[PDB]
Design a protein around this nucleic acid. Structure first.
Lengths: 196, 63, 67, 219, 143, 221, 77
RNA sequence: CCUGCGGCUUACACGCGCGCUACACUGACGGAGCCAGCGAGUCUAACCUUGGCCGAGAGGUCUUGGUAAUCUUGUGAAACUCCGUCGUGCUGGGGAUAGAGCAUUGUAAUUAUUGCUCUUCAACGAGGAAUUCCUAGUAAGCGC
């Protein structure tokens, strides 16, 4: 068909958003976020969970696609997550028509809590010790916080999951702390610097 | 408050502490002279990159 | 009734003032208490005449029509 | 007596174990599988999820394993057990009845999982010999001179019962503390073919609707 | 270059064949559709219960074009699902037998249903011609 | 008009506060069928055989604090929840939607039903008021809170000035223990300050009523 | 649009569609409501702000005279 | 709500535990599409079956296929996918709860044995103290 000829030259993301010209804003995420893979759909179910750093081999978009089916009511549903991801990407490209990939990457870069904190047992005296956060660890924490805020949005609201996800992604791209993930990153930095 | 960047030179070994957090030697990515041990909690490796919110803070043995 | 367009004429005026501009989606067309006594979520059903404001977003369906 | 299932490997190599379950365990059945794991030395376990048993056992066999135990249950509590000795060895299919749970009663110390001391009590008939050799070749070869972990098999009344006891050689005698589960174990078949066959040579089946099996032990 | 119902879509050609039957008009639908739910495992009645029988007949014609022959057991299990039996586990049930037998009689009226080899259901020259006409009408659905 | 909303852990960033009671004699002592409470002057064999003391064990301190606290004007303005740390470590969260009877027989019956239940219900069958958060109070409380022990030995100041100095987004918390012989250290590790209100020793009901009177004139509650 | 009104000594709202407002009464369920809406020749998606008292008394008489209008004996409560 | 060890009773106010169902818009109902494997099955008996039939359904009609890859059987399975309906409403989520009718046995269902249908529409607004298991085709969810 016509879109078959269109995608025959440029392998866009589902032939609706270009899978090129994606940029990572924040530093310390190069080789921690997979954005160099030209693919068609985020369901490449090859064996990547076996190793530690092979989890960075899957795309962060495919990581969020796995994060959609993270609930008792939906653990193991694939095409529901894929269609919801396509709807959320269309909602992002409607709210911000630059690129769903670029806007999502900007939100991921702006939703990162740069510091961490640990509770040390101390032999019976727990204390708050500020510690660093690893690159893939920070990326996974941001993705998890975003998916959790999106899931917590659709508790008493007729809004679609794609709609709440796009609203949280817009709040994270703005960094306005109007989403749970951005509020969580701000509170995490505040707590880490509270006991630095 | 611009947090600098740091490339880990190597993961510092024998850092006895609570399981989950480890001291690792990182030289700052802003300048390759500022190098210090830092307490990283996430799953990390060597020759990676990270954000350091403190300039001259250095990790110690945390028992 | 008493007009068969009750809560759907002044509300229709507000929608033509606002919803024909930004626009909203099929989920955000429930704004301004779009409820019973008319069409709560069926704004996309009647959006055949109005077009050229924003693409739609269908949850149960899957469509994006520039209305 | 050592058998052709054990002659080339009885005291030669010390064994490893694999503990698993039939299909979708209940939580308490998993906990009991944990107990039988931590009782045995050389203890490694693996959950069975959506696995074809010829594929599972065949894949486990090239990786190298001496024996495989797998369980059953009836609405939370376990009832059955089988042992499959890998190198064409005999599968044995038992009914297990009673249990005490280390989680349930008290934390009474530790299952130190040292190479334990072995006790097989009151086995006379050649079937008792088969059970003794098959079960002995699952424990570790080489407990020490004073290995304080005494495992105990008792064969009174066709219901072999197992306990674990830990002893200290106190002033006038040993003193023991009760650990591990306590059992009412009873077999009902022996097949020299491994369970992957489903049709091979059954050594032994318990006659059930035979009159005299009210009285008689060992068929 | 060859026009097939298999090339045509599910919902699109389903609506097209249902409208063509509605354009045909004569199908002799049962009177039970005013009260039936088309299955025992169904809970509410069909929303377009007048065109539900038409959609079922269109799907049956599509199956008869795809497969050689089918039966009322095959149609019922094909058009069958689970049940709202309460809280006990719901197995899959079949569809209504009398509705299936009536629909089998309903498609031989238009000549779409014929007795297959060793009995069963097949298509005729009139049924194949009507299917080809509906498919060619749906072949021009690309506008 | 309308009454103010539910003042609990759900109302966290809004205007709310916590009244915390602890070191009371609140458990379930079944007399050998049903569940009863530990009374000093009522049961002589049972109290002496339990191992407690007549001067030490006090089960009506919580009832008196509830009688002097649930009827507060600030409590009808929707600004306070109730947190109770029992002698057995039980943490209880109470919204101000209802008011327990001051009758220690009826209040003790309701407390024994809660002790045998951990479950209370509403007449409207829509709002189970007796919530039990993850223990203690500060494990699920509001995200902005102020913690202080109102001791008779701490710095005695007026309740209007300190409460007026507090922000409207924080949640001022007060810990009270009405021991006949005791000390202001029951929730010392939880309190982030040590302040005083009275120059004489008072029970939990009197100190709680003084704090409620101070909070009522603080932001006109 | 109409609000609740007195129908068979009940207060029934009309802003909701014709199935479920015709269900809240003792002796009528989902399927009975659906089939009496089928038999009273009313559109299944209408809300009862419309359907003036002609059709309301028609469904009253289809309640008190159901077997006249093909309500079968196997359908009875 | 079923159910494994503990009180008390008969010729019922209970203590320790295992499961399923739900507590709704990734939802619920109407129609469309659909991808399996495991085996099982009847000779002097009637099993497993195909179809046509009628009855909403439940259920009754004669026959071949099969003593077995042949006929079930491609078990056209369920979750799954599309649109339709609906708006967060303790409603259409939810059916514990009853009554009535229908088949359907069986000598009888009577102690709703079972299956359909209608009607009845409880709690359940996410569950504290605790709490187990778990590192990939894994937890998890679905069916034959």
């Amino acid at each position: 068909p016509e879109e078959v000829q269109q995608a025959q030259t440029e392998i866009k993301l589902f032939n609706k958003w270009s899978f090129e010209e994606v940029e990572v804003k924040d530093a310390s995420l190069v080789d921690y976020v997979q954005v160099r893979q030209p693919i068609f759909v985020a369901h490449t179910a090859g064996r990547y969970a076996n190793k530690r750093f092979r989890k960075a081999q899957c795309p962060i978009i495919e990581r969020l696609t796995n994060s959609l089916m993270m609930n008792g009511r939906n653990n193991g549903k694939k095409l529901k997550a894929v269609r919801i991801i396509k709807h959320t990407l269309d909602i992002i490209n409607v709210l911000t028509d630059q690129n769903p990939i670029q806007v999502v990457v900007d939100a991921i870069t702006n939703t990162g809590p740069r510091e961490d904190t640990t509770r040390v047992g101390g032999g019976g005296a727990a204390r708050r010790q500020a510690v660093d956060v690893s690159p893939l660890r920070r990326v996974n924490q941001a993705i998890a916080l975003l998916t959790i805020g999106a899931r917590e949005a659709a508790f008493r609201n007729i809004k679609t999951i794609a709609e709440t996800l796009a609203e949280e992604l817009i709040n994270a791209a703005k960094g306005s702390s109007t989403s749970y993930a951005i509020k969580k990153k701000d509170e995490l930095e505040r707590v880490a610097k509270s006991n630095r | 408050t611009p947090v600098t960047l740091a490339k880990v030179i190597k993961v510092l070994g024998r850092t006895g502490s609570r399981g989950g957090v480890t001291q690792v030697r990182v030289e700052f990515l802003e300048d390759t002279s500022r190098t210090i041990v830092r307490n990283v909690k996430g799953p990390v490796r060597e020759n990676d990159i990270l954000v350091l919110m403190e300039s001259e803070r250095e990790a110690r043995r945390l028992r | 009734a008493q007009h068969a367009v009750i809560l759907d004429q002044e509300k229709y005026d507000r929608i033509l003032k606002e919803v024909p501009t930004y626009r909203y989606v099929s989920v955000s067309v429930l704004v301004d208490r779009l409820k019973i006594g008319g069409s709560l979520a069926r704004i996309a059903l009647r959006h055949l005449e109005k077009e050229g404001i924003i693409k739609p977003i269908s949850k149960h369906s899957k469509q994006a029509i520039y209305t | 007596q050592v058998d052709d299932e054990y002659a080339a490997t009885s005291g030669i190599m010390d064994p490893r174990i694999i503990v698993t379950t039939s299909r979708d365990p209940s939580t308490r059945l998993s906990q009991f599988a944990k107990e039988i794991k931590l009782l045995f030395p050389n203890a490694v376990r693996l959950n069975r999820g959506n696995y074809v048993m010829p594929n599972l056992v065949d894949a486990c066999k090239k990786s190298g394993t001496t024996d495989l135990v797998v369980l059953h249950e009836h609405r939370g509590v376990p009832t059955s057990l089988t042992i499959s000795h890998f190198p064409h060895g005999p599968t044995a299919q038992f009914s297990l009845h009673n249990v005490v749970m280390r989680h349930d009663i008290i934390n009474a110390g530790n299952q130190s999982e040292v190479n334990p001391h072995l006790i097989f009590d009151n086995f006379t008939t050649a079937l008792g010999k088969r059970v003794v050799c098959i079960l002995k070749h699952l424990f570790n070869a080489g407990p020490k001179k004073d290995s304080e972990r005494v495992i105990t098999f008792a064969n009174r009344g066709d219901f072999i019962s197992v306990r674990q006891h830990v002893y200290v050689r106190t002033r006038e005698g040993v003193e023991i503390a009760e650990v591990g589960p306590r059992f009412e174990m009873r077999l009902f078949e022996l097949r020299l073919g491994t369970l992957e066959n489903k049709d091979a040579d059954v050594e032994w089946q318990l006659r059930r609707f035979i009159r005299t099996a009210n009285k008689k032990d060992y068929l | 270059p060859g026009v097939s119902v298999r090339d045509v879509a599910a919902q699109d050609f389903i609506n097209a064949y249902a409208s063509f039957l509605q354009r045909q008009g004569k199908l002799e639908v049962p009177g039970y559709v005013d009260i039936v739910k088309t299955s025992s495992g169904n809970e509410m009645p069909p929303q377009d219960a007048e065109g539900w029988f038409y959609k079922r007949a269109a799907s049956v014609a599509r199956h008869i074009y795809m497969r050689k022959q089918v039966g009322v057991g095959k149609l019922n299990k094909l058009y069958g699902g689970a049940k709202s039996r309460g809280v006990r586990p719901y197995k899959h049930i079949d569809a209504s037998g009398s509705i299936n037998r009536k629909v089998l009689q309903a498609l031989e009226k238009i000549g779409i249903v014929e007795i297959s080899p060793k009995g069963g259901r097949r298509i005729s020259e009139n049924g194949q011609r009507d299917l080809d006409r509906i498919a060619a009408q749906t072949l021009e659905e690309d506008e | 008009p309308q009454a103010p909303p539910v003042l609990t852990s759900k109302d966290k960033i809004t205007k709310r506060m916590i009244v915390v009671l602890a070191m009371a004699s609140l458990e379930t002592h079944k007399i050998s069928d049903k569940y009863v409470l530990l009374n000093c002057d009522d049961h002589q064999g049972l109290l002496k055989k339990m191992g407690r003391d007549i001067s030490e064990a006090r089960p009506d301190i919580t009832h008196q604090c509830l009688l002097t606290l649930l009827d507060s004007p600030i409590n009808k303005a929707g600004k306070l929840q109730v947190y109770i740390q029992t002698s057995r470590g039980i943490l209880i969260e109470v919204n101000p939607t209802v008011r327990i009877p001051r009758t220690f027989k009826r209040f003790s019956g309701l407390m024994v039903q809660l002790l045998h239940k951990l479950s209370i219900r509403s007449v409207n069958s829509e709002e189970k008021l007796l919530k039990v958060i993850k223990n203690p109070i500060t494990d699920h409380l509001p995200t902005k809170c102020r913690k202080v022990t109102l001791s008779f030995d701490a710095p005695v100041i007026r309740v209007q000035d300190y409460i007026e100095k507090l922000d409207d987004d924080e949640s001022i918390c007060v810990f009270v223990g009405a021991m006949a012989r005791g000390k202001d250290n029951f929730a010392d590790e939880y309190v982030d300050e040590k302040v005083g209100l009275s120059n004489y020793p008072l029970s939990a009901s009197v100190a709680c009523s003084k704090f409620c009177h101070g909070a009522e004139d603080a932001w006109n509650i | 649009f109409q609000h609740i009104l007195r129908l068979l000594n009940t207060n029934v709202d009309g802003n909701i569609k014709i199935v479920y407002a015709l269900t809240t009464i003792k002796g009528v369920g989902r399927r009975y409501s659906n089939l009496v809406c089928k038999k009273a020749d009313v559109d299944l998606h209408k809300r009862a702000g419309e359907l003036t008292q002609e059709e309301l008394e028609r469904i009253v008489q289809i309640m008190q005279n159901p077997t006249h209008y093909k309500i079968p004996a196997w359908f009875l409560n």
